Design a protein around this ligand. Sequence first.
Ligand code: FMN
Ligand code: FMN
Ligand code: A1AVS
Ligand code: A1AVS
Lengths: 304, 313
Amino acid sequence: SMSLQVGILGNTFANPFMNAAGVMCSTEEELAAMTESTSGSLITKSCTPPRYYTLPLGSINSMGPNKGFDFYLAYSARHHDYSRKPLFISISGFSAEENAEMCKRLAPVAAEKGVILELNLSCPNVPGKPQVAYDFDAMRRYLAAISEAYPHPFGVKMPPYFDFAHFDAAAEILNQFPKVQFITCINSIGNGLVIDVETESVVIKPKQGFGGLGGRYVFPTALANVNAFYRRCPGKLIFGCGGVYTGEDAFLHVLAGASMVQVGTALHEEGAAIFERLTAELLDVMAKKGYKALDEFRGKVKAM
Amino acid sequence: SMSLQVGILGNTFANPFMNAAGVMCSTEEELAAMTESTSGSLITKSCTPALREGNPAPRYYTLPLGSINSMGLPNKGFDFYLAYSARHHDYSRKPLFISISGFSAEENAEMCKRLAPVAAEKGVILELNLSCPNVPGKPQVAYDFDAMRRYLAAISEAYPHPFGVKMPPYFDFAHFDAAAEILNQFPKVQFITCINSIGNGLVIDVETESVVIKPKQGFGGLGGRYVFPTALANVNAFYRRCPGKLIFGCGGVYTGEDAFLHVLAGASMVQVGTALHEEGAAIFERLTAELLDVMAKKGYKALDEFRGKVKAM
Ligand SMILES: Cc1cc2nc3c(=O)[nH]c(=O)nc-3n(C[C@H](O)[C@H](O)[C@H](O)COP(=O)(O)O)c2cc1C
Ligand SMILES: Cc1cc2nc3c(=O)[nH]c(=O)nc-3n(C[C@H](O)[C@H](O)[C@H](O)COP(=O)(O)O)c2cc1C
Ligand SMILES: *[C@@H](c1ccccc1)C1C(=O)NC(=O)NC1=O
Ligand SMILES: *[C@@H](c1ccccc1)C1C(=O)NC(=O)NC1=O
């Protein structure tokens, strides 16, 4: 009598789980593996018109690499089985102009197939360019340019914030753009640094070893960002991303406000079989509490 | 022939370790325990001009991989820590730092005016907190570069001695460059402590479905293993950008290997917060032994043989 279904963006998703953009989604074989999996959805690698490393408590990466917009647009147009599950496409152009150009072309494919855009405003490894959403004027201009060029709804992938003045400013900007229908919190925590004791060397080569953190390191930061935007953007959906390894982690993301739950580091380590385990663990927690649907507790974190 | 000594700021420190501000340093009993410990130094709780009781409890919580807190600046008040520095601290045991965290530039400058004669006579060293993440309505001062500059200007006018600054974590090179450009314009800033807690994380208990600390809807500063790669990145970013200042490392230190990495990234002193909260002051015996082990396996005889020498790829 229980269900993980999520009914959003006019679709019924079988469950809230999907891969995080950039994990298991660059090669046609990875897309296929994601489509074959029990995940509720999947998203493509952020496309444009040692770089990874496993840590004890997560991951660090300086990917900075994609088969181009045309490969993922082509996959969205005539290669993805939409009868299996809905599909998201991530774009991370190097300017508002590039982003707008890519959106003009995705518009027909989005109308004819139903693929959904997530705009990446938070790459932390872009040489010479800080996270777009750490610059609220650039953020506003990207969103305006995309809203004028792109007729369909879209979502935004946000970087983590760390104080209420930034939450308030970010939400006030997003609330002016009705085409932004969902907000994904969070991208990796930017520009961490990992050093190996034995070699006394950084573990990734680009950018003097600085890279984005994922995994167990980022979970309380991810929950905070999910909840902060859930409270400030009641007219939008929040997707949670960050630190999910168990159905109990996913349960907390939903409690904080998440509609969908994306899985990055833990999926990179465990492969697509993880979604079989995650759905069963989440249903297990719900059973123990007597919940029958996610709508019963999404966003219902209590003050103590 | 191996040595953990640090010679900085006109002082000799027996080793690089001290508490992080706010941990085991609020009462006379805690400060005495830190002085009797084997730490190379110690720092007082960040203080305000008047006594404060802090945020309502629970305001601290132990996490799987660290801590979250919204302490809210509970502290005995500046007069108490000034008196400890002036009259109670045994400087023949080790040097002392005092952390101040007034709610405005003027509050800080007034405290510095009274601290100045005690610093001159006794040698206590000031650390200015520009990174509380739990001040109601006032964001981390160092997240607002105009306010940061204003604070440093006000302190530098009011205070004749060199001092240090406790910094929040930054997460992109544009902010590192902007913060370092400001710090490099104030010659009295002699050390930079990276980092304060990662601000405004959130923890929820599965069983009760509720936040685990009371203030601010459950939001609070993260310490511990969560913050270690961020802390090293901040230590190294400012080590590279502020060669004329010392960097003190703070964040995620539970072992001598963690401390070794802080020093490799550029740290002169290494501060210990969450781990010391959990283990108590005997931790410093373990950390010095562990760091000496790392050094012995590598043939290092002094910290200057590898401080700041992290290798690129
Ligand atoms: C190797 C790797 C590549 C990634 N590539 C992208 C990307 O292209 N676009 C994006 O928005 N996020 C990207 N991410 C970030 C993830 O989508 C996610 O936000 C982050 O890893 C936090 O989730 P996690 O804790 O489950 O790893 C990447 C992460 C990793 C580890
Ligand atoms: C309970 C608690 C109280 C703290 N109080 C202060 C403080 O008064 N002033 C300050 O600069 N930092 C304070 N901090 C931050 C620590 O000094 C330190 O920067 C942070 O905990 C990261 O270090 P760690 O990973 O070793 O815990 C406090 C941290 C905790 C957990
Ligand atoms: C940013 C990215 C990289 C290549 C193409 C498009 C976007 C990406 C990264 O490298 N590391 C991250 O942690 N998150 C990202 O989104
Ligand atoms: C901030 C603080 C502010 C005024 C007086 C004393 C302490 C403090 C906090 O509450 N939590 C932290 O993580 N770091 C701090 O410095």
